[PDB]
Amino acid sequence: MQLSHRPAETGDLETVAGFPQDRDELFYCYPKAIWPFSVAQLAAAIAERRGSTVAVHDGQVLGFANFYQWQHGDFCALGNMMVAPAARGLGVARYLIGVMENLAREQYKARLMKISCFNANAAGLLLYTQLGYQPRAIAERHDPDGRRVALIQMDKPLE
Numbered sequence: 786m787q788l789s790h791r792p793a794e795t796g797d798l799e800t801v802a803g804f805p806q807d808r809d810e811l812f813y814c815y816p817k818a819i820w821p822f823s824v825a826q827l828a829a830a831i832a833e834r835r836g837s838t839v840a841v842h843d844g845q846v847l848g849f850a851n852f853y854q855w856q857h858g859d860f861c862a863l864g865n866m867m868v869a870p871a872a873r874g875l876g877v878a879r880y881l882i883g884v885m886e887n888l889a890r891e892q893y894k895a896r897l898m899k900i901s902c903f904n905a906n907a908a909g910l911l912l913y914t915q916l917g918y919q920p921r922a923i924a925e926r927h928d929p930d931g932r933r934v935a936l937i938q939m940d941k942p943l944e
């Protein structure tokens with residue numbers, strides 16, 4: 786996979802908003818969103834957040850991420866990670882995580898990245914583990930059905 790990155794642009798929003806395939810996938814990456822996802826919801830997040838970035842391969846936008854918390858000299862928290870359904874498990878998330886780590890270090894002088902992952906997303910938990918993130922706490926949250934879920938709060942020093 787040859788991959789590149791650039792800041793997200795308005796022209797990318799229809800594409801990226803197409804990435805979540807079901808209510809679960811949307812909840813794992815943007816729990817405040819309501820199904821069905823839309824460009825308006827995506828743009829609302831982008832406006833409130835920082836560092837919205839896309840990953841590109843062979844002319845296709847395949848991934849997106851941003852920060853929902855950022856604290857200069859301290860840490861950032863990574864969210865809205867979305868990957869195109871045809872490109873799952875091909876290293877797009879791993880690549881974007883690395884890009885966002887660099888951006889947190891370089892731009893925000895962060896010493897730490899925080900990643901919070903919902904308990905049902907095994908693939909996320911195992912990826913973040915492979916990338917050196919360790920679990921620190923578990924917090925209660927609720928899903929759209931009012932069911933209790935566990936948010937596993939992980940972090941990694943940036944160096």
Ligand SMILES: CO[C@@]1(NC(=O)CSCC#N)C(=O)N2C(C(=O)O)=C(CSc3nnnn3C)CS[C@@H]21
Binds near residue numbers: 813817865902903
């Ligand atoms: C403020 O904190 C968040 N919200 C909550 O705790 C509330 S929940 C119940 C509701 N509604 C936030 O906003 N978060 C996000 C996100 O990006 O929207 C995520 C998604 S985490 C994620 N997505 N892709 N990669 N990653 C790491 C994990 S909960 C965390």
